[PDB]
Design a binder for this molecule. Structure first.
Ligand SMILES: *[C@@H]1O[C@H](CO[C@@H]2O[C@@H](C)[C@@H](O)[C@@H](O)[C@@H]2O)[C@@H](O[C@@H]2O[C@H](CO)[C@@H](O[C@@H]3O[C@H](CO[C@H]4O[C@H](CO)[C@@H](O)[C@H](O)[C@@H]4O[C@@H]4O[C@H](CO)[C@@H](O)[C@H](O)[C@H]4NC(C)=O)[C@@H](O)[C@H](O[C@H]4O[C@H](CO)[C@@H](O)[C@H](O)[C@@H]4O[C@@H]4O[C@H](CO)[C@@H](O)[C@H](O)[C@H]4NC(C)=O)[C@@H]3O)[C@H](O)[C@H]2NC(C)=O)[C@H](O)[C@H]1NC(C)=O
Ligand SMILES: *[C@@H]1O[C@H](CO[C@@H]2O[C@@H](C)[C@@H](O)[C@@H](O)[C@@H]2O)[C@@H](O[C@@H]2O[C@H](CO)[C@@H](O[C@@H]3O[C@H](CO[C@H]4O[C@H](CO)[C@@H](O)[C@H](O)[C@@H]4O[C@@H]4O[C@H](CO)[C@@H](O)[C@H](O)[C@H]4NC(C)=O)[C@@H](O)[C@H](O[C@H]4O[C@H](CO)[C@@H](O)[C@H](O)[C@@H]4O[C@@H]4O[C@H](CO)[C@@H](O)[C@H](O)[C@H]4NC(C)=O)[C@@H]3O)[C@H](O)[C@H]2NC(C)=O)[C@H](O)[C@H]1NC(C)=O
Lengths: 208, 205
């Protein structure tokens, strides 16, 4: 029979004003004989009608995939509003309902430390600057780097890792030429998370 | 029926004394008396040492052939082919696996002391940076005073623009114990290391 999967918005979409956080309801394994899927969307139990439904697409596996996308309000998602996808189809005994929301757990603020390159790393031609982001909940977060008050690309960030606390940590790091580290330039680790004041903290780092 | 083919653990691959196992998993087989046949090959030659794990079905029926692989063959990236025959299939389904291709690059291992501000609290993070390795198959562990340390976490490998991989491993310890000059070590096993092993240590300065 049809299976239903309900996906949350991307972390960055929830945390950045200029972005569009979406909940996505995906229906798979829809037969040729019972191809119609009906969607009903609810927000804390109230039905809404502005969800955008895509037309069915036959997959290489000879089954249909149907998708409905509901745009979520930033503040609603962060206040724990529940989003319910209801799927109706005639190869089903009864409608399938799935509900998604922000993570239930008590929110915890990240702690953010900056770490200079290893002393042993100081022999090489390029150097790593490290940002440690610790003890946050939930795992939605975004990290960015800056130099000279201007955005810096070419950083990498690990996924959140479940820690024994129940909280999360991650590392982000920037690789720079050695000269640029030791001409005293300042670098910055920026973190956006729902539990920070103004959902933002910045911590910086420079040659000592 | 769907076929999934899985690689061995890094340590089993890197230690002479251990048995690296590749796993062929067939799921979604009918309890209409469909019975399954296996053909394993290695670079085109078929093999008969595969050893079927008994069954156990769970509610809603999966058969599993476990193939012990040669250490050097795996490190050379030989392709392990699980071929599955079943009537509820058009023709055999074949799945192929192998060490990631490409010349191996060793990690450069660095240890990093806790942040100055983290020294304001009761526990501290000791950090191990593992950089520029290929492929991503790796193992990391922590030691203190000649003994295993199990209160660490390790991030997944992350792909850098290099094509190589990076990770961090974090050990959490009481501040008090760090400030007694204790020594801690990050040990890393990877195929491009000499003896597939390196250790790096770190203690209060
Ligand atoms: C026929 O085809 C369709 C389509 O497949 C496509 O075409 C076929 C022909 C092939 O070519 C495929 O290669 C190709 O994908 C098949 O449909 C697939 O069906 C399976 C289930 O049978 C679905 O699996 C679910 O996948 C989700 C994760 O899926 C995300 O990640 C996949 C990346 O690997 C990606 O493919 C998916 O599209 C999806 O990607 C996300 O998409 C959203 C919206 O588009 C986007 O916002 C995201 O950013 C994007 N993410 C990424 C990374 O790109 C997985 O979570 C599901 O597992 C849950 O459920 C399992 C139960 O089945 C359970 O065991 C798991 O543990 C997990 O459980 C859930 O998760 C946690 C922990 O359990 C918990 O919080 C939840 O409560 C729990 N919920 C449960 C258990 O229900 C599951 O793996 C595929 O998504 C689906 N593919 C697509 C594209 O829809 C179809 O099956 C084919 N064949 C047949 C015979 O039907
Ligand atoms: C009936 O029930 C069975 C039973 O299922 C299990 O138990 C039941 C009771 C429920 O709890 C289930 O939710 C639970 O799964 C159902 O069988 C399941 O079927 C699905 C799909 O049919 C399979 O999902 C795939 O699984 C692999 C990962 O599996 C490992 O990780 C699992 C986490 O869920 C975990 O179960 C195990 O760890 C498992 O096994 C590894 O096993 C080896 C052998 O012992 C062991 O050494 C390892 O340690 C162990 N792993 C770990 C971490 O320990 C996952 O890879 C699949 O995703 C791949 O496939 C997707 C579909 O192809 C694809 O979209 C993904 O991207 C990915 O595919 C690879 O990636 C690309 C994309 O880049 C893709 O296009 C390619 O095809 C593919 N290859 C490459 C090179 O890229 C997916 O999650 C379940 O494994 C299977 N359950 C079991 C136990 O096998 C069954 O579905 C039910 N029947 C029906 C009709 O629904």
């Amino acid at each position: 029979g049809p299976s239903v999967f309900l996906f949350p918005p991307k972390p960055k979409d929830t945390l950045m004003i200029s972005r569009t956080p979406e909940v996505t309801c995906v229906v798979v394994d829809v037969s040729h004989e019972d191809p119609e899927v009906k969607f009903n969307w609810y927000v804390d139990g109230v039905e809404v009608h502005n969800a955008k439904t895509k037309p069915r697409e036959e997959q290489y596996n000879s089954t249909y995939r149907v998708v409905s996308v509901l745009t979520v309000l930033h503040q609603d998602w962060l206040n724990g509003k529940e989003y319910k996808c209801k799927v109706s189809n005639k190869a089903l005994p009864a409608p399938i309902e799935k509900t998604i929301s922000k993570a239930k757990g008590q929110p915890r603020e990240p702690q953010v430390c900056t770490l200079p390159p290893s002393r042993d790393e100081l022999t090489e031609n390029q150097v790593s600057l490290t940002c440690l982001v610790k003890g946050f909940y939930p795992s939605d977060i975004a990290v960015e780097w800056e130099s000279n008050g201007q955005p810096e690309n070419n950083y990498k960030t690990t996924p959140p890792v479940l820690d024994s606390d129940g909280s999360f940590f991650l590392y982000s790091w920037l690789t720079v030429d050695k000269s640029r580290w030791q001409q005293g330039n300042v670098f910055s680790c920026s973190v956006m998370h729902e539990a920070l004041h103004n959902h933002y903290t910045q911590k910086s780092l420079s040659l000592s």
